[PDB]
Paper text:
Transcription activator-like (TAL) effectors specifically bind to double stranded (ds) DNA through a central domain of tandem repeats. Each TAL effector (TALE) repeat comprises 33–35 amino acids and recognizes one specific DNA base through a highly variable residue at a fixed position in the repeat. The crystal structures of TAL effector (TALE) proteins bound to their respective target DNAs have revealed that the residue at position 13 is the only one directly involved in DNA base recognition, whereas the 12th residue stabilizes the proper loop conformation. dHax3, an engineered TALE protein, proved to be a useful scaffold for structural characterizations. We then present fifteen crystal structures of engineered dHax3 variants in complex with target DNA molecules, which elucidate the structural basis for the recognition of bases adenine (A) and guanine (G) by reported or uncharacterized TALE codes.
The structural observation suggests that Ile34 may not be a major contributor to the affinity of DNA binding by TALE repeats, consistent with the classification of NI as a “weak” TALE code. It also insinuates that base A may “tolerate” a wide range of amino acids at position 34 of a TALE repeat when there is no steric clash. To test this speculation, we generated dHax3 variants with the 34th residue on repeat 7 substituted with different amino acids. In total, we obtained nine high-quality structures that elucidate the accommodation of base A by Leu, Met, Cys, Pro, Trp, His, Thr, Asn, and Glu at the 34th position. Among these, the hydrophobic residues Leu, Met, Cys, and Pro all adopt conformations that do not clash with base A. As what happens to Ile34, there is no specific coordination found between these hydrophobic residues and base A. Trp, Thr, and His, in spite of the presence of polar groups, do not form H-bond with base A. They also appear to adopt conformations that simply avoid steric clash. These residues may all represent weak code, if they are used for base recognition.
Author numbering: 231 to 721
The structure:
DNA sequence: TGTCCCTTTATCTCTCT
DNA sequence: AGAGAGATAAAGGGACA
C-alpha cells in the first residue's frame, strides 16, 4: 500500500468529531492543522478539545487552530494548558499574549523560556513584558530570548545600541542569528562602510537579518562604485525584507533593467525595497514587455505594481485578470492598476473579481466604491468585512453606506470596521460622541488603535488628559490617532 | 516522523509627518 | 496620503533524536 494511509485514516477518524462541538472545525481549519501540525497535532486538539475551550482556559476555536497548526503544535498545546495560568498570573500577561507566543514553531520552548527568563530580562535589563513577548512571538523565540539575555549588555555597552534597537532585531525569525551577526559586523559596517547604527539596525530587523547584513557587507562596495548606487539606496534594499536575495538580484539586473527597458536606477530600487524584491525584479524583466504591449500599461504603471510586497504576485495576477476585470466587470485598467499597486495586490484583485457584483447588486455600492475600498493594503480584508458588516453597521447603528466605505477605505479597514462595530455604542451612548465623529476617527489609517485609545481615556480617565474636552480629544484622534493620543498622556 | 530553528515570500496593519 | 516600519502568515529547508 502506502506508508501514510494508517496515518491519514487516523487523521480523518478523528477529524470527523472536531466538526462537532465544542470546536466545530470546518474543512479549512482541519486542513490547516493537518498540514502544519501533523497527525499528532490533530489528535492533540481532539484529546484536549475540552480542557482548552471553556474552564478554565477559555480559548476560542480560532485560537486553538492558531496554536495547533505549527511544528510540534501538540507540544505547544500541552504547554499552553500548563503555563498560561502561571504566565497570566505570576507574570501579569494576558491570554492574547500567551497565545501569540504559543502560535509558532517550537511554541513550547518559547513559552517555557518566557517563563524562565521574563523576570531576569525585565529587571536586570529593564525590558518591558511587551518587549519580552515580541521577542518570543517568532519561530525559535527561545533562542532569541537566550541570545537577547546574553548579548543585551555587550550590544548596548560595547556597541552603543539602545534596548529598543536590540529588541527590534531579536523580534524576527532567526533572531539569535541577527543579534550575533550585528555583534560582529556592526563596527565593520559603521567604520569601514560609513553606515550609521540606525541603518545597521534597520537591515538586521527582518527575517534573514544575518544574510542581509552579511550580504550588505559583501555587495555594498560593488553596488556603490560599480553600479552608481548610494549607500542610502543599498540600505533600503537590504532593510526592507528582500535582503540577501534582493541585493544579489539588483546587482544582476539593475544594468539590464536600466539598459533594455529604460528604467531609472531609482525605479529599480523601489522594486527591490520590499519582501521578495527578487521575485519582483525578475517578474518585471519577464513581463514588462508583455504588459506594456497587449494592454497599454506604461512602464511607470508596471513599476508601480511591482513596487510593493508580492509585486510578482501582483504583476502575474494583473496579467490574468486585467481583461476579465475590464471586459466583464467594466473596470478601466487604471482602476485595475490602482487595486494592484498595494501589498497583496493579488488578493485585492481576486477578491474584487469575486465580490464586486455582490457589493454592487446586493449592497448597492458603486464600482468606484469597490475600487476605492480595494485600493489599500489588505483591500481583500476590507472588502470581505464591508460585505459582512455593512448591513449591521448601517442598519442598527445608523451609519450611511458612504460612511462605512470611508472607514473601509484605508489600511486596516477591516480592523477599523470591526472596531467601530464594537465601540460605536459606548462612544456615542455612554460618552456623548456623535457618530460623525466616530467615523472621522476611524476614517484614517490606524483607525482601530485610535478608537481604543479614545475609549481607554474616556472609560478609565488618565487625569493627564484632563484639560481636553471630547471634541479636542477627537481632533487629536483624527489628526494623529493613537500616537497623538498618548504623547499627550506624556504632557 | 516529531519537533525546533531558520530564511524567503506574501499579506496585512499601523506610523510618521 | 504616501514612505517607512512592524506584525502575522505561509511555505519550505536544515538538523537532530
Amino acid at each position: 500500500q502506502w506508508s501514510g494511509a494508517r496515518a491519514l485514516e487516523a487523521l480523518l477518524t478523528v477529524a470527523g468529531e472536531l466538526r462537532g462541538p465544542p470546536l466545530q472545525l470546518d474543512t479549512g481549519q482541519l486542513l490547516k492543522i493537518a498540514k502544519r501540525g501533523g497527525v499528532t497535532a490533530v489528535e492533540a486538539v481532539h484529546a484536549w478539545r475540552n480542557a482548552l475551550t471553556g474552564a478554565p482556559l477559555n480559548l476560542t476555536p480560532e485560537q486553538v487552530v492558531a496554536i495547533a497548526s505549527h511544528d510540534g503544535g501538540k507540544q505547544a498545546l500541552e504547554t499552553v494548558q500548563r503555563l498560561l495560568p502561571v504566565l497570566c498570573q505570576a507574570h501579569g500577561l494576558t491570554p492574547q499574549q500567551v497565545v501569540a507566543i504559543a502560535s509558532h514553531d517550537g511554541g513550547k520552548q518559547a513559552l517555557e523560556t518566557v517563563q524562565r527568563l521574563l523576570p531576569v530580562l525585565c529587571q536586570a535589563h529593564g525590558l518591558t513584558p511587551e518587549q519580552v513577548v515580541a521577542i518570543a512571538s517568532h519561530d525559535g523565540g527561545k533562542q532569541a530570548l537566550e541570545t537577547v539575555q546574553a548579548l543585551l549588555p555587550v550590544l548596548c555597552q560595547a556597541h552603543g545600541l539602545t534596548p529598543e534597537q536590540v529588541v527590534a532585531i531579536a523580534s524576527n525569525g532567526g533572531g539569535k542569528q541577527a543579534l550575533e551577526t550585528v555583534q560582529r559586523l556592526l563596527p565593520v559596517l559603521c567604520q569601514a562602510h560609513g553606515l550609521t547604527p540606525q541603518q545597521v539596525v534597520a537591515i538586521a530587523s527582518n527575517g534573514g537579518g544575518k544574510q542581509a547584513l552579511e550580504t550588505v557587507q559583501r555587495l555594498l562596495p560593488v553596488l556603490c562604485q560599480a553600479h552608481g548606487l548610494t549607500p542610502q539606496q543599498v540600505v533600503a534594499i537590504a532593510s526592507n525584507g528582500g535582503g540577501k536575495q534582493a541585493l544579489e538580484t539588483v546587482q544582476r539586473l539593475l544594468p539590464v533593467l536600466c539598459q533594455a527597458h529604460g528604467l531609472t536606477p531609482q525605479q529599480v530600487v523601489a522594486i527591490a525595497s520590499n519582501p521578495g524584491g527578487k521575485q519582483a525584479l525578475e517578474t518585471v524583466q519577464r513581463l514588462l514587455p508583455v504588459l506594456c504591449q497587449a494592454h497599454g500599461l506604461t512602464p511607470q504603471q508596471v513599476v508601480a505594481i511591482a513596487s510593493n510586497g508580492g509585486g510578482k504576485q501582483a504583476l502575474e495576477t494583473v496579467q490574468r485578470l486585467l481583461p476579465v476585470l475590464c471586459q466583464a466587470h467594466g473596470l478601466t485598467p487604471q482602476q485595475v492598476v490602482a487595486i494592484a499597486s498595494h501589498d497583496g495586490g493579488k488578493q485585492a484583485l481576486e477578491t474584487v473579481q469575486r465580490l464586486l457584483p455582490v457589493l454592487c447588486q446586493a449592497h448597492g455600492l458603486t464600482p468606484e466604491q469597490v475600487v476605492a475600498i480595494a485600493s489599500n493594503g489588505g483591500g481583500k480584508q476590507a472588502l470581505e468585512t464591508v460585505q459582512r458588516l455593512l448591513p449591521v453597521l448601517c442598519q442598527a447603528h445608523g451609519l450611511t453606506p458612504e460612511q462605512v466605505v470611508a472607514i473601509a477605505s484605508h489600511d486596516g479597514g477591516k480592523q477599523a470596521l470591526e472596531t467601530v462595530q464594537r465601540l460605536l455604542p459606548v462612544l456615542c451612548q455612554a460618552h456623548g460622541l456623535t457618530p460623525q465623529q466616530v467615523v472621522a476617527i476611524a476614517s484614517n489609517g490606524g483607525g482601530r488603535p485610535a478608537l481604543e485609545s479614545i475609549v481607554a481615556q474616556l472609560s478609565r480617565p488618565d487625569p493627564a488628559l484632563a484639560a481636553l474636552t471630547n471634541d479636542h480629544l477627537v481632533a487629536l484622534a483624527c489628526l494623529g490617532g493613537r500616537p497623538a493620543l498618548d504623547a499627550v498622556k506624556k504632557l
